[PDB]
Amino acid sequence: MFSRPGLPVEYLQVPSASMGRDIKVQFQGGGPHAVYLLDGLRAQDDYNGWDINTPAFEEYYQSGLSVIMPVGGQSSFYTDWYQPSQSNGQNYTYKWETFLTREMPAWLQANKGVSPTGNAAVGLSMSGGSALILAAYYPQQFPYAASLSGFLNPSEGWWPTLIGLAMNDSGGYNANSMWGPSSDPAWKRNDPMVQIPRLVANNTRIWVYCGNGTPSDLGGDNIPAKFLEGLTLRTNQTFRDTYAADGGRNGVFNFPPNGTHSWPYWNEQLVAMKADIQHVLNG
Ligand SMILES: CCCCCCCCS[C@@H]1O[C@H](CO)[C@@H](O)[C@H](O)[C@H]1O
Ligand SMILES: CCCCCCCCS[C@@H]1O[C@H](CO)[C@@H](O)[C@H](O)[C@H]1O
């Protein structure tokens, strides 16, 4: 969308006792509360997708909010896996939920003064659901969560199968090593749709977005991007319906007649939610 720098962006090495390795984290200070920008399915080990494809850091510079971009975790869904991925030779078990909710916040608090509470989890595609799940089980840390083109009903119908195929295509990861067979309780535990009651109880402020598959001049005009957005939109519409039916009253639902499963649109939403996050996290 556009690079950015001249800005105070740091590259940190945060030890993960649970994963037995150091996790690289891109960071821009600016306030005690932060926006956790989670990556997509094809998360790389060099830079977080938001920095690679958008002016995210530049857009939140001097916003009164710090920006945290963890790096890595391809096809991890930012969850704690049952075991190492039985397929691509992963020699350790992904424990990203533990990292994001315990190890990383403790590190940032001790060394930089970033508050472990009152933050926002923002995810897209793969991590859209993850952000909502984090808010569902860790309300103190995440009173705010945004899901951009997320897959909000992972345990339903063919989603477990499709997620498995996508994970295999992205680094050869195995969904079975993550949450087990589709019949395993882990699938429902991490299903935003199923956890709506928790988001209601917590009074989580949620920002849910999803395009309809029709590209605009912003780009992302390709079959995969168009089909994926159109498909998951159905899940997002049902999430919205269920949220309301369950008593939900603190959400923003953006379902415009455009947008594909691509970065330009996720960046547009990141900008649009800035004021919303500022007012919710900084009163
Ligand atoms: C059942 C859910 C299947 C999801 C499959 C999504 C395939 C890629 S999507 C999306 O493509 C971008 C490049 O276009 C990447 O940068 C993002 O990381 C990635 O998330
Ligand atoms: C060409 C026909 C393509 C049909 C694609 C269906 C994809 C199913 S998604 C599924 O759709 C339901 C519709 O009711 C929602 O309730 C669910 O939450 C959502 O996950």
From Swiss-Prot:
Keywords: Acyltransferase, Secreted, Signal, Transferase. It comes from the Bacteria. It is found in: Secreted. GO terms for cellular component: extracellular region. The active site is at S125 (nucleophile), E229, H261. Homodimer. Belongs to the mycobacterial A85 antigen family. The antigen 85 proteins (FbpA, FbpB, FbpC) are responsible for the high affinity of mycobacteria to fibronectin, a large adhesive glycoprotein, which facilitates the attachment of M.tuberculosis to murine alveolar macrophages (AMs). They also help to maintain the integrity of the cell wall by catalyzing the transfer of mycolic acids to cell wall arabinogalactan and through the synthesis of alpha,alpha-trehalose dimycolate (TDM, cord factor). This is Diacylglycerol acyltransferase/mycolyltransferase Ag85C. The gene is fbpC.
